[PDB]
Design a protein around this ligand. Structure first.
Ligand code: MN
Ligand code: MN
Ligand code: MN
Ligand code: MN
Ligand code: MN
Ligand code: MN
Ligand code: NH4
Ligand code: NH4
Ligand code: ZN
Ligand code: ZN
Lengths: 184, 368, 368, 184
DNA sequence: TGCGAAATTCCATGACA
DNA sequence: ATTGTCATGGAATTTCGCA
DNA sequence: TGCGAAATTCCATGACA
DNA sequence: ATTGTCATGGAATTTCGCA
């Protein structure tokens, strides 16, 4: 079979609800399967229309062959199916109750959750403005498996923000407290 | 000088007065009988006044001024005196058009890598569409890949909002723009400084300097026009489609699309190229690095037969930006301090300011 | 045509399909292994649709459209099909710019005598001066002698008032103007008819056609500007002075002033020429008749390397006069009925109207 | 001495008062001595300022070396003298009580008076609009002395209005009556 | 190689400001 | 403290398909 | 004729619309 | 049912002044 390439498959999923940030409550996470490159879109709801609007932005830059998701209602609607069909995108779904398909992707999901927790200490409603910072960190994070950052694999060049990732990889005490205080 | 005209009358030789002519006196005036007829030779001290009077009738150039004078007068080297006064008439210097072309354009090297340099600019105002009137256009200089953002105003705040979205993908080394207000504000300077982005500015009133992005306006507006034929001009909803269409369009001199130059492989768009399907990503990227270094580069065209190029110390005049009705098109003479390159100079005004300007907005001051 | 593709599969020769290649079947598609890689050969009946789809992505020209198609497909003479659809895409025809230059300008003979032909036009609006905003400019075509009249509006009534004053001196055979409202009204037509004056009109939106008078705007505005430097723009009181100054200015290529060409002798103005002082008026007039017939006449410049000239029956498109934002710059194709001269034609619209137009406002329709 | 030329001498004079025509009451008559070419300017008064204003129009086309006039107040004022001096025009005056100097000019004066009388029959207030017609007739009138019209001598060409002069040379009965009715 | 047709490359023209 | 660009479609040139 | 300086003529450039 | 023009000022070319 043919080697894996950027745009073969985008894995998508919702993260949230998060504290309200400029009206927004969720992040739609899109990860390119081959490169690990991540795109983040704030939404007000985990709905088909929010997904379509966000993905209309992404697909004005690049269209995947396949989108992979869990069986979230936003993704299994006939509207989303027609949206995909219009663009020649094949929709692939994980079986119900097995929503986790790719480890590379799941690692990105926990990286995102961890980076948000670290950045949002003392400013939980400020994540909207911080999305670019998160995205840059993820995409300039060296992959020990692939031996490159997602930026290098997507664009074939080094980046101008090579040290965008300052993740210590575990939460500190104060970071775990701020997360604890938020739920309380 | 009546003393000079004195020797002449008594037959002696004075340099400049051809000796083969008869110089007589009549009506208290020195005269000469020249092939064209009899002319008055005025004394030296009268000559500047005569030139001034003939010139001032209609503020005429060299030959037209001379033809008037020669109706009445003759003296040695009359055009030398004519040109001296043309070079001193401020009204003519600041009003007349240049007759020398600018030297030939530069073709700067394509930036080496994607994200080395963005060119940014606004299109508009356009017909209102969902309350939007302008498009921010961002062009990567290496690839020609282009992002479009609808805005309500060509402002810093809208520029900042759009660029916070774009730079989520990557941060450029340099942003090149013209001197529009959105880009020259301290707020935009701060935004760029926070991000380690160097701001680069065109010389004033010289869109060619941002030619990479100005040229894009044409393709964007042409496609919008085509798609809107026979419909109301609802362009807002078409921007994303136009962005995608143009980024996946081949340039015939390149034989690549901006998308291909950026990513090295087509995404799932119509008529996707399949030539690297059997290569690994690393091999595909290696092919990409080579494709990027071998793109056509245009060279400087030849100079036109009467062009000029700036020289340190030369007197030049800057074009008036937005001249009022019946007001001069040129500023007062100034001096070239520094030649940055053959097309760009630093000048000192008469009011002591240092200005970096394009030679397209200068003329060399006439009559030395 | 699957029948055509059938013979090909079983090894038989079909014209257009190079015989040195292996044409196999795979996934229910006819394919060929070409030097660039494997391509699908679609049946004849599929091809127009494929071309249309590739072209419509960004409404691209020949090569850009072809590069898309060739990513997936191969068939004989693909560009022939590409060009067929480019020639049928209305959106592209009416939006794209021409890449052919107009043929070289005509230089019409100078009118034989003063008062044979006046060129008339308005300058303005200018800064208000004693309530006046415009200048009617009347240029005699033989002499270049020029009359100026301040007006409040570029109207027929003001044109009529000014011309009743001017024609007190003499009546011209012909008045040439552009298609401004002042000149095309029935009231102006009546005025001219009463006086035996033939009205002649430029082709629309083509100031070059009135170049004799348009060029005069430049000298008039330049002199006003010079005289107004450092003063409020009070031009009303300067018009008579500017009229006199310019009428007595030498043109260097002619070596005469318009005044001299009109009267044959200078009046009591500064630096008056005195060469005919000893001639009688009859001899002076005889010299004048000879001077008038021997003025320099410029010739047509050479054609640029890619110019075009109109031919009866050719499809051409007229420039849209004042195109709206995001609307096409060209009208739908029309046919040349009559070539009046190499620079001027009569066209029939798609809506049946006869229009006399300059070739500068036409493009030849692309792709035959 | 040198032969006579256009612009050597303009003879000027007022004719009027005439019936009011668009506010105007006088005609300033200017005749070029050599060619006989006539210029007519309507004025509201036979004053220095009216003369200067009219002559500013004429002298934007051609400046005479000499202006000749009678000793009318408008012409002998210091203001008119300064106007002339500014333009390098020499003023020449006929001696008081001998206001008629040139027969060629006086013939033009009676031609004007006669043409006006003929044209103004039944429309005495309409002369303003008729001035161009009068001027054209005068300037296209053959001179038996010079053997040309003033148009031909000024411009060196034939004219496009060769038959502008339809003067019968004496007043008819009705023309003499209309003149008589005007004074009564 | 050598011919005629097809493909590709050249590049003047005009248009973005 | 900087600097023109490039889609377009006929024409000119080169390559292809065959002998 | 032949030389060097002055005069004249040429003409690209830009600007009127 | 008509159509480009021409001031400008360096450079190219021609003429002048003298031998
Ligand atoms: Mn989920
Ligand atoms: Mn997850
Ligand atoms: Mn701009
Ligand atoms: Mn006009
Ligand atoms: Mn009198
Ligand atoms: Mn009298
Ligand atoms: N460069
Ligand atoms: N002609
Ligand atoms: Zn001047
Ligand atoms: Zn099209």
């Amino acid at each position: 079979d043919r080697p894996q390439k950027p745009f073969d498959k985008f894995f998508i999923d919702y993260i949230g609800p998060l504290p309200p940030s400029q009206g927004y409550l969720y992040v739609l996470v899109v990860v390119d399967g081959m490169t690990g490159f991540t795109w983040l879109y704030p939404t007000k709801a985990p709905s088909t229309s929010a997904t379509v609007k966000s993905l209309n932005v992404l697909t004005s830059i690049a269209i995947p062959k396949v989108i992979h998701s869990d069986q979230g209602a936003a993704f299994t609607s006939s509207t989303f199916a027609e949206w995909a069909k219009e663009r020649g995108i094949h929709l692939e779904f994980s079986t119900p109750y097995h929503p986790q398909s790719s480890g590379k992707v799941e690692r990105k999901h926990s990286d995102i959750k961890r980076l948000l927790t670290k950045l949002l200490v003392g400013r939980p409603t400020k994540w909207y403005d911080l999305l670019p910072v998160v995205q840059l960190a993820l995409n300039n994070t060296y992959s020990p498996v692939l031996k490159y950052t997602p930026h290098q694999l997507l664009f074939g060049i080094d980046s101008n923000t090579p040290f965008a990732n300052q993740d210590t990889l575990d939460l500190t005490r104060e970071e775990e407290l701020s997360l604890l205080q938020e739920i309380r | 000088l009546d003393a000079e005209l004195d020797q002449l009358l008594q037959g002696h030789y004075i340099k400049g007065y051809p000796k083969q002519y008869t110089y007589f006196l009549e009506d208290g005036k020195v005269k000469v009988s020249r092939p064209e007829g009899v002319k008055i030779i005025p004394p030296q001290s009268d000559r500047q006044k005569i030139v001034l009077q003939a010139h001032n009738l209609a503020h005429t150039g060299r030959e037209a001024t001379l033809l008037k004078i020669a109706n009445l007068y003759w003296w040695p080297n009359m055009r030398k005196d004519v040109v001296k006064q043309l070079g001193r008439c401020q009204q003519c210097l600041i009003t007349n058009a240049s007759n020398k072309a600018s030297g030939p354009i530069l073709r700067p090297d394509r930036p080496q890598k994607p994200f080395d340099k963005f060119f940014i600019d606004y299109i508009g105002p356009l017909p209102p569409s969902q309350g939007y009137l302008y498009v921010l256009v961002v062009v990567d200089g290496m690839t020609g890949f282009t992002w479009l953002y609808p805005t309500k105003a060509p402002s810093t705040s809208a520029t900042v909002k759009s660029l916070n979205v774009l730079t989520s993908i990557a941060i450029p080394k340099v942003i090149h723009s013209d001197q529009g207000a959105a880009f020259t504000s301290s707020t935009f300077a701060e935004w760029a400084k926070e991000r380690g982005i160097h701001l680069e500015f065109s010389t004033p009133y010289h869109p060619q300097s941002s030619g990479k992005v100005e040229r894009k306006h044409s393709d964007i507006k042409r496609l919008l026009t085509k798609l809107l034929v026979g419909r109301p001009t609802k362009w807002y909803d078409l921007l994303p489609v136009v962005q995608l269409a143009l980024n996946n369009t081949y340039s015939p001199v390149l034989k690549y699309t901006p998308h291909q130059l950026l990513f090295g492989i087509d995404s799932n768009t119509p008529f996707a190229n399949q030539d690297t399907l059997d290569l690994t990503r690393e091999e595909e990227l290696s092919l990409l690095q080579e494709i990027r270094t071998s793109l056509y580069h245009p060279s400087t065209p030849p100079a036109s037969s009467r062009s000029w190029s700036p020289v340190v110390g030369q007197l030049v005049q800057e074009r008036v930006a937005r001249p009022a009705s019946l007001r001069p098109r040129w500023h007062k003479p100034s001096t070239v301090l520094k030649v940055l390159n053959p097309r760009t100079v630093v000048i000192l005004d008469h009011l002591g300011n240092n200005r970096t300007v394009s030679i397209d907005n200068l003329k060399p001051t006439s009559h030395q």
